[PDB]
Amino acid sequence: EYPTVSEIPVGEVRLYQIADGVWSHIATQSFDGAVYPSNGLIVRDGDELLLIDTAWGAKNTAALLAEIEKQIGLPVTRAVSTHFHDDRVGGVDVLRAAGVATYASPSTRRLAEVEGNEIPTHSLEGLSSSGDAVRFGPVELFYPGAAHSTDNLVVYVPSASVLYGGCAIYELSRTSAGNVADADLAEWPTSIERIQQHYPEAQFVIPGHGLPGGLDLLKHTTNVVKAHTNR
Numbered sequence: 001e002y003p004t005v006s007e008i009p010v011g012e013v014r015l016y017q018i019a020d021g022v023w024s025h026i027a028t029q030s031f032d033g034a035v036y037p038s039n040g041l042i043v044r045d046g047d048e049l050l051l052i053d054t055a056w057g058a059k060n061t062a063a064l065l066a067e068i069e070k071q072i073g074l075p076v077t078r079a080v081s082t083h084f085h086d087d088r089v090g091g092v093d094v095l096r097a098a099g100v101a102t103y104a105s106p107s108t109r110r111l112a113e114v115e116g117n118e119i120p121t122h123s124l125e126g127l128s129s130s131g132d133a134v135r136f137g138p139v140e141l142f143y144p145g146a147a148h149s150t151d152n153l154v155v156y157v158p159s160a161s162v163l164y165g166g167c168a169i170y171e172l173s174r175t176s177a178g179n180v181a182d183a184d185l186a187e188w189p190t191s192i193e194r195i196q197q198h199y200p201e202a203q204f205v206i207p208g209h210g211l212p213g214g215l216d217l218l219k220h221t222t223n224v225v226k227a228h229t230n231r
């Protein structure tokens with residue numbers, strides 16, 4: 001059974017096996033008063049591991065690396081942040097100190113700079129236009145356009161038909177759009193469709209927060225967006 005926010009004390013991390021050599025990681029952090037859960041991805045990359053997003057903070061991210069070492073036992077060598085918020089780059093400095101090569105789009109890097117957040121080292125070339133995609137070891141990184149934020153990425157894991165939505169895809173239980181400060185509600189519905197388009201095959205879709213699903217998570221998000229465009 002998937003772990004829920006109330007089962008993960010702040011400072012602990014959980015690994016959850018999705019498919020052969022594909023796990024999610026789950027952690028918890030406070031924000032504007034209140035604690036929320038947050039997801040990321042781990043994909044085997046030959047004899048190494050590829051990290052999709054931090055565990056939302058330095059302490060969580062240290063505990064992630066340690067759980068990884070305890071449960072999987074292969075070194076984490078690269079990480080990719082999918083947008084510039086703290087649930088995506090918070091802990092990049094720990095990764096860096098651990099010896100992980102960190103990566104992100106050039107726009108994600110500039111925006112973390114402006115926000116005062118931690119900044120990944122390496123720029124991901126080839127992700128500038130709505131619809132671009134590049135192969136990053138065992139995964140495909142894909143830029144569907146603005147949504148939750150202007151830079152936000154999603155990742156697809158070919159060999160397993162896993163699609164990682166990042167904070168661009170809500171979980172069904174979630175019906176309020178929550179914080180959309182840096183959002184473009186206008187393009188957001190189009191970008192989800194850009195996703196559905198490119199990844200029709202996804203058998204498993206993971207939101208940035210909460211419980212995983214199938215392609216239905218795309219449409220549910222859309223509704224919840226539009227229900228807020230209107231009012």
Ligand SMILES: COc1ccc(Cc2sc(N)nc2C(=O)O)cc1
Pocket residue numbers: 031036037038085086087167171174177178179208209210
């Ligand atoms: C699934 O339950 C929830 C409810 C609300 C939030 C608000 C936050 S905090 C954070 N670091 N990201 C978000 C987001 O919406 O992307 C996150 C998860």
Ligand SMILES: [Zn+2]
Pocket residue numbers: 083085087148149167
């Ligand atoms: Zn965000």
Ligand SMILES: [Zn+2]
Pocket residue numbers: 085087167208209
């Ligand atoms: Zn988020």
